[PDB]
Amino acid sequence: DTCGGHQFTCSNGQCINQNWVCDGDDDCQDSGDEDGCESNQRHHTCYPREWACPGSGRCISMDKVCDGVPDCPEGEDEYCGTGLCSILNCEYQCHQTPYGGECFCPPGHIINSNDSRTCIDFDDCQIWGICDQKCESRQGRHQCLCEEGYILERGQHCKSNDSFSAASIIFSNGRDLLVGDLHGRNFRILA
Amino acid sequence: TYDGIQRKTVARGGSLVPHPFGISLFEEHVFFTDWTKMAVMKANKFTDTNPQVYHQSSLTPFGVTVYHALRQPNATNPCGNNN
Amino acid sequence: QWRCDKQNDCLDGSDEQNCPTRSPSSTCPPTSFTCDNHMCIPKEWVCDTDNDCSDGSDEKNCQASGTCHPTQFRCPDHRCISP
Ligand SMILES: *[C@@H]1O[C@H](CO)[C@@H](O)[C@H](O)[C@H]1NC(C)=O
Ligand SMILES: *[C@@H]1O[C@H](CO)[C@@H](O)[C@H](O)[C@H]1NC(C)=O
Ligand SMILES: *[C@@H]1O[C@H](CO)[C@@H](O)[C@H](O)[C@H]1NC(C)=O
Ligand SMILES: *[C@@H]1O[C@H](CO)[C@H](O)[C@H](O)[C@H]1NC(C)=O
Ligand SMILES: *[C@@H]1O[C@H](CO)[C@H](O)[C@H](O)[C@H]1NC(C)=O
Ligand SMILES: *[C@@H]1O[C@H](CO)[C@H](O)[C@H](O)[C@H]1NC(C)=O
Ligand SMILES: *[C@@H]1O[C@H](CO)[C@H](O)[C@H](O)[C@H]1NC(C)=O
Ligand SMILES: [Ca+2]
Ligand SMILES: [Ca+2]
Ligand SMILES: [Ca+2]
Ligand SMILES: [Ca+2]
Ligand SMILES: [Ca+2]
Ligand SMILES: [Ca+2]
Ligand SMILES: [Ca+2]
């Protein structure tokens, strides 16, 4: 059966107690518990030329990897060999990295596959702020989606159907309660 | 998120967000009140490296909300069955 | 206490009809900082992201390519704090 409101759900169809969700442990086989509990970090997945290290599964841009400062959780980025570029028949380009070098597909919305010897188009819709409400994949592309009350503008943004009355802002300035318009041009006192 | 799983910073810094108190959200933007700015401010929901001012006050503004239909969507009420 | 303040406490507004004003050339010592509302605040308090003098003038210009006052302490991304 599905999870209750006091539980958390996993990609494999597994249910977990809510307290375990961000306790610092991989109670979820997909590691969905600790997916982003660190502020502004990403775990077990990477933007187009970022690189992840065994210590805690955190991903960092390749340029900083061998820069001389430990960026990985365990400092594993700081070492910086090249040998595997000789071994690999990978399709594009190599970088000097610990564990004998690394190979990466062209930066423009592509990334490495099941091994560095192969490549696929990038996971657009994984970018924070790429769309206002929902995102879908397309052939070499991505598409926005807005819920039923909204209409889609500028290819990125969702705005509200004019059927509904114009949005208002209600705020207090200490002594008084004020009403205003979303454009910020007019203000009146409600109480 | 509702489960606390993915965490993102919209803005930070003493100069940008010195003393926020109240926050409200609509479409692309978040509206927040700041006692150090003595202002009501507008920012972008995903990232804003330079918030803007919607209203300037001589006193510290406390509370802010957005009034619109889509902020209060409809749903069924279980208590309708004779309370 | 209501005789002269921001509030209009009687229907005639006679509390705020007339009021005293500050004597010019008054002194804030060199150890301290001055606010646009003619009040004195310690220099160490100024850019602490918090409204120490209620016109907000202490937090008015932080990180205009500047640095913390020498006695203060600094937090890499956040703010200057008192000793
Ligand atoms: C890895 O290989 C499996 C089996 O061919 C395939 O289903 C899957 O899509 C591949 N994943 C990636 C990221 O290439
Ligand atoms: C706006 O709302 C009305 C009523 O639900 C609907 O008939 C109409 O198709 C909507 N328009 C858009 C552009 O979504
Ligand atoms: C909610 O239901 C009322 C009553 O039918 C309707 O007037 C209103 O437009 C609905 N709002 C939304 C957002 O569905
Ligand atoms: C799972 O969801 C269904 C609705 O699709 C029911 O609400 C069911 O009660 C849920 N399971 C649990 C354990 O609460
Ligand atoms: C009060 O302040 C005003 C300026 O706002 C004038 O300087 C006036 O002379 C002051 N009154 C006294 C008695 O000092
Ligand atoms: C008093 O304040 C004035 C400015 O209003 C001068 O700074 C002066 O030096 C201060 N100190 C004394 C002792 O007068
Ligand atoms: C900040 O430091 C610079 C030197 O790097 C200057 O001394 C400047 O005057 C300092 N700012 C303040 C407010 O003390
Ligand atoms: Ca656990
Ligand atoms: Ca966990
Ligand atoms: Ca490094
Ligand atoms: Ca008064
Ligand atoms: Ca203080
Ligand atoms: Ca201050
Ligand atoms: Ca603060």
Side-chain angles (χ1 to χ4, degrees), chain A residues 149 163-164, chain B residues 68-75:
Chain A
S163 176
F164 304 112
Chain B
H68 192 232
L70 298 177
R71 293 292 297 158
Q72 294 195 338
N74 284 311

Side-chain angles (χ1 to χ4, degrees), chain B residues 12-15 18-19 35-36 38, chain C residues 49-51 54 59 62 78:
Chain B
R12 67 182 185 127
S15 193
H19 199 101
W35 293 1
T36 289
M38 302 218 293
Chain C
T49 77
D50 301 327
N51 198 342
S54 307
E59 303 294 342
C62 311
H78 178 198

Side-chain angles (χ1 to χ4, degrees), chain B residues 32-50:
Chain B
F32 73 89
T33 62
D34 189 294
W35 293 1
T36 289
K37 304 279 184 179
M38 302 218 293
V40 186
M41 297 205 70
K42 190 173 174 184
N44 182 284
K45 185 166 73 179
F46 298 97
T47 288
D48 201 322
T49 51
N50 189 22

